[PDB]
Design an enzyme around this catalytic site. Structure first.
Site, PDB file in Angstrom:
ATOM      1  N   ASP A  11      12.410  53.469  11.119  1.00 36.56           N
ATOM      2  CA  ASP A  11      11.372  52.661  11.398  1.00 36.56           C
ATOM      3  C   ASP A  11      10.025  52.730  10.272  1.00 36.56           C
ATOM      4  O   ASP A  11       9.469  53.663  10.713  1.00 36.56           O
ATOM      5  CB  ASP A  11      10.738  52.777  12.776  1.00 36.56           C
ATOM      6  CG  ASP A  11       9.588  52.047  13.230  1.00 36.56           C
ATOM      7  OD1 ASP A  11       9.299  51.073  12.631  1.00 36.56           O
ATOM      8  OD2 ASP A  11       9.045  52.331  14.373  1.00 36.56           O
ATOM      9  N   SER A  48       0.511  39.505   0.939  1.00 40.70           N
ATOM     10  CA  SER A  48       1.169  38.564   0.643  1.00 40.70           C
ATOM     11  C   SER A  48       0.652  37.526  -0.095  1.00 40.70           C
ATOM     12  O   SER A  48      -0.641  37.212   0.259  1.00 40.70           O
ATOM     13  CB  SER A  48       2.206  37.803   1.606  1.00 40.70           C
ATOM     14  OG  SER A  48       3.096  36.815   1.189  1.00 40.70           O
TER      15      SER A  48
END
Length: 330
Positions: A35, A199
């Site tokens: 994770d 992004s």
């Protein structure tokens, strides 16, 4: 040194991925959920409340000759999906894919929430976010990667998750055969303890690319892709019959649909998520309403590039002095 381990989807939907981890002496192998959105290595154990164990493999520290109780240390964690676990702490030898750390903090669960009990395939979590998020008290502990870093050939690990197929976590090297083209690297902020990056935009299907900054985290422990409501609405508007269902808890779509792809930007580069990666199947057994793999982050407080996004790429988690993230197509 290096390590290399195969990671395997837990079910036919890729709801999560498990990777075998050797703990203790002799080795006890547990299948952990790696994770990158948390920083605790915790396991089901011989200390876990019996009624909360249902099929998991447990770590038994008393059978490990290298286990030592970390005196006074406790841990307690709550995840974004509302699940939680807590317990005490041992140090022991932990190996992943041939890479060994001695003195790793292994957090032994005394209690786990129902979601964990109900998933027989996940024996615990191995956190790969920054150690500043580790929950051990009163002395915070380091992640497996943080402990291994100095010994690694290069201070990196990579995630290469499969679509409906096994993939690979590598530590300490970049497998140049595992991706196509070049790796595009992008800046990371560690201010919130995550692999947080921005992004450069998105496209839906064959549509034009929208240049827009989307700050979010690269999180292998989250199944879906969570993005701003504007982006998500633009995606699902291209699927006839798709709608946001408050009763179901997100966007659903007719199972008869063919889903469009979704592209996200990494600098000037582009990662394409095929439409099929966005199908999470019937909302309930036998239903013709299917759950979407792109969902709104509104009210999470953060955008999350979870498995739906990451499995479309070869992802480098670069733990150099100034960390960065790399993405390649594959």
């Amino acid at each position: 040194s290096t390590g290399s381990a195969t990671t395997t989807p837990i079910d036919s939907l890729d709801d999560a991925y498990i990777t075998p981890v050797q703990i203790g002496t002799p080795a006890q192998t547990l299948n952990l959920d790696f994770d990158t959105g948390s920083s605790d290595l915790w396991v089901f154990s011989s200390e876990t409340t019996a009624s909360e164990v249902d099929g998991q493999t447990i770590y038994t520290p008393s059978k490990s000759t290298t286990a030592k109780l970390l005196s006074g240390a406790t841990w307690s964690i709550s995840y974004g999906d509302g699940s939680s676990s807590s317990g005490d702490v041992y140090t022991d030898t932990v190996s992943v894919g041939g890479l060994t750390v001695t003195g790793q903090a292994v957090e032994s669960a005394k209690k786990v929430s129902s979601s964990f009990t109900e998933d027989s395939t996940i024996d615990g979590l191995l956190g790969l976010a920054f150690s500043t998020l580790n929950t051990v008290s009163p002395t915070q502990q380091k992640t497996f990667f943080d402990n291994a870093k100095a010994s690694l050939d290069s201070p990196v690990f990579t995630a290469d998750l499969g679509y409906h197929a096994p993939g690979t976590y590598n530590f300490g090297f970049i497998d140049t055969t595992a991706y196509t083209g070049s790796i595009t690297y992008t800046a990371v902020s560690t201010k919130q303890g995550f692999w947080e990056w921005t992004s450069t935009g998105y496209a839906v299907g064959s549509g034009t690319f929208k240049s827009t900054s989307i700050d979010g985290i690269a999180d292998t422990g989250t199944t879906l892709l969570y993005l701003p409501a504007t982006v998500v609405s633009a995606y699902w508007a291209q699927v006839s019959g798709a709608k946001s269902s408050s009763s179901v808890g997100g966007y659903v779509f007719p199972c008869s649909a063919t889903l469009p792809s979704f592209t996200f930007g990494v600098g000037s580069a582009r990662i394409v998520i095929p439409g099929d990666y966005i199908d999470f199947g019937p909302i309930s057994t036998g239903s013709s309403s299917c759950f979407g793999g792109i969902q709104s982050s509104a009210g999470i407080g953060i955008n999350i590039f979870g498995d739906v996004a990451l499995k479309a790429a070869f992802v480098v988690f670069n733990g150099a002095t100034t960390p960065t993230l790399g993405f390649a197509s594959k």
